[PDB]
Amino acid sequence: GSSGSSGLRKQVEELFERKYAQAIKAKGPVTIPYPLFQSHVEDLYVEGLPEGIPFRRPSTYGIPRLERILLAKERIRFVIKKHELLNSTREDLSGPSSG
Numbered sequence: 001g002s003s004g005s006s007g008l009r010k011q012v013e014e015l016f017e018r019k020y021a022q023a024i025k026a027k028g029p030v031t032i033p034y035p036l037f038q039s040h041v042e043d044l045y046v047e048g049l050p051e052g053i054p055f056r057r058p059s060t061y062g063i064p065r066l067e068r069i070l071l072a073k074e075r076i077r078f079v080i081k082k083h084e085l086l087n088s089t090r091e092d093l094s095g096p097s098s099g
Helices: 008-023 034-039 063-071
Strands: 044-047 077-080
Touching: 008 063, 008 077, 034 044
Parallel strands: none
Antiparallel strands: 044 077
């Protein structure tokens, strides 16, 4: 039972952020606001997703569900209609360093 080194979730986790970061040309690790997006799904929403797989924490999706998301990565896309909507919320991350 060894996990960590390369994992679907991680793959998606990095992907999700990646796409998002791309939408903001971010060469760094960014966080995806589930609320800001949930409260504003008419502005902030993920696209290119496969069928039967919405835009939610990849820490829930099934092993097979993730794979697809990775297979749709080519299509996957993050539309940031409202940018400001993002800004303002708490500011400052503060925590450990991941890379």
